[PDB]
Symmetry: C2
Subunit: 209 residues, 2 copies
């Protein structure tokens, strides 16, 4: 039984995930919250200029503080997607998949005032993470990736994998490698292992060192 709350100024961005959940809600619950619910002024401000100057805006600690105060508990794992985070990996997804309550705080502009995470970390577990070495406009797409990578590891919803093939055996001048049709399953395994090695050398030499 996992609950996921997402907080974002673009709640519509997350509709897809909710629409991808199968009739297993009848194990999981994913709720999306508009951050502007916790604003204080009639202009519904979520952003303000950075101390020390610089470009862009920083998300207000008073707004985020109120939102997390309402949504989080002592048992919550607070996930903050950010290009400045620790790497989110399959290992991370596996770890988080057994959590009872994930809260994902999606930032925009240049990030959330650091005191939000720092305050939260005094009473719950907080994880600032990056899904890869690129910059997005906001954390919403990273939240989608995280939610998908974690939930597909919840029961009931080294080397690279080599090429796969299905019917027909010949297509546009290209035959499926005959070994796959050979019925020699020891040999097929060895062939696949070698394909995996070559692909990894070529595309991800970092994985071999």
């Amino acid at each position: 039984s996992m609950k996921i709350d997402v907080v974002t100024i673009f709640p519509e961005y997350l509709q897809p995930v909710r629409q991808s959940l199968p009739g297993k809600a009848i194990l999981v619950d994913v709720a999306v919250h508009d951050l502007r619910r916790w604003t204080h002024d009639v202009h519904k401000s979520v952003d303000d200029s950075p101390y020390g100057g610089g470009p862009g805006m920083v998300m207000k600690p008073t707004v985020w503080g109120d939102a997390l105060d309402e949504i989080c508990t002592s048992e919550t794992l607070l996930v903050v997607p950010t290009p400045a985070g620790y790497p989110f990996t399959q290992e991370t997804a596996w770890q988080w998949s057994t959590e009872d309550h994930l809260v994902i705080a999606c930032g925009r502009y240049e990030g959330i005032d650091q005191r939000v995470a720092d305050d939260a970390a005094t009473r719950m577990r907080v994880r600032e993470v990056s899904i890869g070495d690129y910059v997005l406009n906001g954390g919403e797409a990273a939240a989608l990736v995280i939610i998908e990578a974690v939930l597909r590891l919840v029961p009931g919803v080294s080397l690279l994998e080599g090429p796969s093939y299905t019917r027909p055996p010949s297509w546009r001048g290209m035959d499926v490698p005959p070994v796959l049709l050979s019925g020699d399953h020891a040999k097929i395994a060895a062939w696949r292992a070698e394909q995996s090695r070559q692909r990894t050398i070529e595309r991800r030499p970092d994985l071999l060192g």
Copy 2:
């Protein structure tokens, strides 16, 4: 002016594309989503089949994909295939693709797409199989959204880790903004921020500075 076509068996998952929405609104980019099932011809609209050589799961049929890409792609197209087995998609990739006229993103499901699809396409156009990170998703759709966002924000007309940022009020819940940021001394602030960044990079991403883990 860039054109992006996404091909998927779940076109509704690509709705969040409508900042990428502000780019489409302006008219600097056009994003179109295509249901792969549109190129099927049997009544069950089958797009997948069991793998040759054995193994778990299903593989997407080359025939349906070939017909789709035939209609959508030209020789000038950059065909992008998100896959956990791909070359890494990085900020450098995003910059490179930001000057493309036409991206076509093929979203796979199950255990992926028959390798011959990319092989065939590569005889007519440039093909890039890419991974957005070292985790497994159920399909290429979420990766397409990441790639679209990373690229579109770089389009003309649209290292180290960034350190912590702060805004008003200067004291909150008994936690103060670092005094140097309030001091108005640009050199001291630049120095403090450079330091915080290097400090955060060594702790969180030591690989960026050439260290283990």
